[PDB]
Amino acid sequence: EGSMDLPAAQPFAGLAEAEAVLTREILGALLEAPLELDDGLRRRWLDWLADSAASALPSLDEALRRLGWQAAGLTAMGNALRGLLAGEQAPAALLLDPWLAPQAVAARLPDGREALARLLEALPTPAAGERLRVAVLDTRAGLWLDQGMASLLRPGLELTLFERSRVLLDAAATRLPERIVVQALDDGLLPAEHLGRYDRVISFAALHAYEASREGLALAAALLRPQGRLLLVDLLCESPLALLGAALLDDRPLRLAELPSLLADLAAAGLAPRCLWRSERIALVEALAPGLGLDAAALQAGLEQR
């Protein structure tokens, strides 16, 4: 059911150039103190200069006028990244920071704010006067939702935050407002009493950070209320800043998807999509789930039956 006709007009290569100049600026921050990296990444930071900036991608400080973070936000990035690496606090301190966490940087720089704002919509709940139930799967430390928080919150809304961690969700529950419910995929695993619960489920700039899209999509499909809507965005291009802000993990870039590949995976997940905005930078997608015939009460009946 894999429909796509994507509006690719709000994207332009000047967003990538803007990020590549932001790469020039944050390279120009950490390359004054790259000794706190490992040597494999310290060489790769010289290669990340080579693969961006005045080497491969020369462009104006107009970048910082595009990106929505000025040189003051970038100063917080450069300084926090030095403080992180001096203490050897990688990976976790990369995630525990809005200026560095791969999705939280995505949530402004590759126009993932505009993606976050559209993904914050498709939630008719206060206008419907209706209990619209939502999960986030890509939560981690949550510091991307922070950037939409003031209208991710809506009347009628029910919202719950998920990830494969206790620590990063205790972090999220702290720094995002405590009126949002928080639920780990505790030790990598969903409590089944949530199944069929959420009229919507959210992924954001971390679908690559599942071991396949087939992991996250299939968790979402049944965590969704039957015929609910997946709400999704991801990095498809690895951002020139994510060449720093994700590869600091020294995890594989081979994680990232192409949009037709995602639509095929999403069709394998049986969801029926529309891809909608921010494209190769950050592709917004929504998709209708099937009638699974599956909810926590249906599973309870699956006991009572047998």
Side-chain angles (χ1 to χ4, degrees), residues 39-72:
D39 67 286
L41 283 191
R42 172 161 46 264
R43 286 187 295 284
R44 239 175 301 148
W45 271 74
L46 307 176
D47 301 335
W48 297 346
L49 169 61
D51 297 338
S52 73
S55 175
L57 292 177
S59 196
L60 304 182
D61 74 320
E62 183 59 28
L64 315 190
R65 294 181 286 283
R66 312 328 316 138
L67 290 158
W69 295 350
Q70 250 283 0

Side-chain angles (χ1 to χ4, degrees), residues 7 36 42 51 79 96 156 171 198 276 288:
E36 326 309 349
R42 172 161 46 264
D51 297 338
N79 292 357
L96 298 167
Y198 301 91
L276 289 166
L288 169 142

Side-chain angles (χ1 to χ4, degrees), residues 102-131:
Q103 56 187 169
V105 299
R108 189 47 276 164
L109 284 22
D111 286 17
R113 216 305 183 99
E114 289 85 358
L116 180 60
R118 281 293 187 80
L119 172 139
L120 168 169
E121 195 37 275
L123 300 185
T125 185
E130 168 63 328
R131 193 68 176 189

Side-chain angles (χ1 to χ4, degrees), residues 38 186 190 200 209 221 248 252 292 297:
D38 64 272
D186 192 333
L190 179 72
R200 305 289 201 267
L248 274 159
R252 305 287 60 65
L292 288 95

Side-chain angles (χ1 to χ4, degrees), residues 103 133-142 144-145 158-166 168-170 172-173 176 180-186 188-204 206 210 216 219-220 222-224:
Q103 56 187 169
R133 307 157 198 93
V134 185
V136 175
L137 294 182
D138 294 27
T139 311
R140 297 178 179 205
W144 58 277
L145 295 163
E158 170 165 322
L159 178 69
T160 306
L161 303 180
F162 300 76
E163 187 48 299
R164 307 181 306 200
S165 181
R166 299 314 309 213
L168 303 186
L169 287 196
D170 286 352
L176 311 187
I180 305 170
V181 181
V182 184
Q183 178 59 65
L185 306 168
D186 192 333
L189 179 67
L190 179 72
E193 302 83 2
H194 287 271
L195 292 165
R197 183 164 182 139
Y198 301 91
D199 305 279
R200 305 289 201 267
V201 175
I202 299 174
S203 164
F204 186 87
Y210 294 72
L219 171 59
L223 182 62
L224 277 168

Side-chain angles (χ1 to χ4, degrees), residues 1-62:
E1 313 309 321
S3 300
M4 180 270 294
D5 53 5
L6 163 63
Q10 344 86 50
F12 63 113
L15 303 177
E17 289 186 42
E19 290 189 290
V21 167
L22 146 75
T23 318
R24 197 274 305 288
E25 295 309 323
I26 304 306
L27 293 165
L30 187 63
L31 295 183
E32 309 190 331
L35 307 185
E36 326 309 349
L37 298 162
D38 64 272
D39 67 286
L41 283 191
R42 172 161 46 264
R43 286 187 295 284
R44 239 175 301 148
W45 271 74
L46 307 176
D47 301 335
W48 297 346
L49 169 61
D51 297 338
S52 73
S55 175
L57 292 177
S59 196
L60 304 182
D61 74 320
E62 183 59 28

Side-chain angles (χ1 to χ4, degrees), residues 65-95:
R65 294 181 286 283
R66 312 328 316 138
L67 290 158
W69 295 350
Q70 250 283 0
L74 276 78
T75 294
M77 306 170 79
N79 292 357
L81 181 55
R82 292 176 186 171
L84 195 181
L85 299 170
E88 301 282 6
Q89 297 303 281
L94 189 83
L95 309 188

